[PDB]
Each structure stands twice: as structure tokens, then as C-alpha cells.
Amino acid sequence: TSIPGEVAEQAMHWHLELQEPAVSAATLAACMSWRQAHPLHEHAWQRTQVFAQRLREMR
Amino acid sequence: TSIPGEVAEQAMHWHLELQEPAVSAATLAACMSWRQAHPLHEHAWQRTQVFAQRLREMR
Incomplete structure (x- = not known):
């Protein structure tokens, strides 16, 4: 299930700040x-x- | 005023738990x-x- 667009953009911005x-x-x-x-x-x-973590494990 | 990333994340987690x-x-x-x-x-x-409190005031 997908994240609404504007929430996804905020999620990204805050994860990257951290x-x-x-x-x-x-x-x-x-x-x-x-x-x-x-x-x-x-x-x-x-x-x-979770997904950032899974992605790191593959890369 | 700089908090390292991994400490910032733990700080956030414990503040949210409280x-x-x-x-x-x-x-x-x-x-x-x-x-x-x-x-x-x-x-x-x-x-x-300090900053979470200053923030609540502005909201």
C-alpha cells in the first residue's frame, strides 16, 4: 500500500535530514x-x- | 549544537516513547x-x- 504523494515527499525530506x-x-x-x-x-x-534498510542490504 | 546522526535517532525514539x-x-x-x-x-x-517545547508554542 502506497503513501500519498505529499506525505511521501515529507517522509523523504525528514529521513534524509536524519x-x-x-x-x-x-x-x-x-x-x-x-x-x-x-x-x-x-x-x-x-x-x-524498513525499505531503506532492505535496500542497503542488497546494495 | 550538533548531534551525531545515530545519537539523534535514539534521542528522537526515547522522546517519542515518553x-x-x-x-x-x-x-x-x-x-x-x-x-x-x-x-x-x-x-x-x-x-x-528545549526545541520540542519551543515548537509546541509556535504551533
Whole structure:
């Protein structure tokens, strides 16, 4: 099951912010706020983790 | 003000665990253990709190 487009774009943006070597506390605060704003955000966050992880294991 | 990636992610996870309406005593002991395991964890925990609070005010 697919993630609505605009949620997918936010999910991507927040996952990438968190792959930086360093992350500010402000970015962290904003990420958490996005994840908590709507169950779809949190679901998309988690699914993206799983798939990013699976992709790394293949590559 | 820079938190390394893997510490930022743990910080976020424990902060989110503590925003649940009910928290288990186990989760609590685990959160404490992380915060106490390394001064960077505790620093990340504090900064994150400062920024999550500033954020709630702006929403």
C-alpha cells in the first residue's frame, strides 16, 4: 500500500535530514512534530525505514 | 549544537516513547539507561526537549 504523494515527499525530506552526520536539535524537534502530526506521517516514516534498510542490504 | 546522526535517532525514539499517554516502567528504565550511558545522550535529550517545547508554542 502506497503513501500519498505529499506525505511521501515529507517522509523523504525528514529521513534524509536524519542521515546527515550531524543533525540539529531543531531539525529533530521538527521531525518529531511531523511524525506526530498524523498517523500517516508516522506510518510512512516507519515503512521508509524498513525499505531503506532492505535496500542497503542488497546494495 | 550538533548531534551525531545515530545519537539523534535514539534521542528522537526515547522522546517519542515518553510522549505516549501511557509509558511502561520498562521503557522508562530503558530511557533512563540511555540518557545515563553517555553524556552525549543526555545532552541530545535536553536540547531536544528545549526545541520540542519551543515548537509546541509556535504551533
